[PDB]
Amino acid sequence: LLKPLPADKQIETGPFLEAVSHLPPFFDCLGSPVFTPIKADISGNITKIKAVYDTNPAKFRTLQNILEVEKEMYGAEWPKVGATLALMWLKRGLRFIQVFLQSICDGERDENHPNLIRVNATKAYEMALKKYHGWIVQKIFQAALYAAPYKSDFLKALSKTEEECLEKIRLFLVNYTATIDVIYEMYTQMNAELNYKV
């Protein structure tokens, strides 16, 4: 349910924030929240970007606008500032979700534990977040990934058949993956990416 990538790949800020604000609730689909540190990270960053955007939606109409306006505003401090920094981290939590969901949809699993999703959560964490966490934070995120629900309970919860659920996730993944990949491409192109750990 994300907007299709526009012809020119300039992602509009407001509709983006609106769409991705629907993602933290899925971490609540089993009742007690799952992967809470990932949820909290995404949520907190969305809030920070929306706060900058809301001050001047026309100035911050696109995500590229955020980066270029804040670069001008903040000089040498940029990109470790403002909505740019928040989106730098948001894209990592969003990529976590992308890789996790794609891995599940592709039937990736531990053949000895086919109803767990630990292999899929570990893979997603490795590709999206792990490089950017210190040892304390790694232990936090690690505990959450380990306490993942059963695969069957996860799929049930999103469907509140299993194959039909997976088809819907695959559909979602098309514009979702493209959008995230465009954000990553922009960060690299603008030299807005930082590698510091938390």
Q: What amino acid is encoded at 130 in this protein?
A: K
Site for ligand CCCCCC in 69-98 (CB under 6 A): 97
Residue 62 backbone phi and psi in degrees, to 5: -115, 165
Q: Print burial letters for 81-92: b (CB count within 10 Å at least 16), e (below 16).
A: ebbbbbbbbbbb
Return the SS3 of 151: helix
In the list 172, 177, 178, 184, the residue contacting ligand CCCCCC (rule: CB under 6 A) is 172
DSSP assignment of 52-115 equals: HHHH-TTTTSBHHHHHHHHHHHHGGGTTSSHHHHHHHHHHHHHHHHHHHHHHHHTT---TTSTT
Closer to ligand CCCCCC by CB, 78 or 176: give it: 176
- Interface mask (CB under 6 A) for ligand CCCCCC, residues 94-113, using x and -? ---x----------------
Closest approach of Cβ 91 to ligand CCCCCC, in Å? 15
Q: Which of 11, 13, 17, 27 binds ligand CCCCCC (CB under 6 A)?
A: 27
How many whole angstroms separate alpha carbon 18 and alpha carbon 2?
A: 9
Q: Does 150 bind ligand CCCCCC (CB under 6 A)?
A: no
Can you say whether the dihedral through the CA atoms of 198, 68, 19, 91 is positive or negative?
negative
- Is residue 59 a known part of a binding site? no
* Shortest reach from residue 138's CB to ligand CCCCCC, in Å: 20
Stretch that binds ligand CCCCCC, among 19-27, 45-53, 82-90, 188-196 (CB under 6 A): 19-27
Distance of CA 179 to the CA centre of its chain: 11
Residue placing its CB nearer to ligand CCCCCC in the complex, 94 or 186: 94
Interface pick for ligand CCCCCC out of 5, 23, 30, 81 (rule CB under 6 A):
23
β-partners of residue 62 are 12
Q: How many residues bind ligand CCCCCC (CB under 6 A)?
A: 7
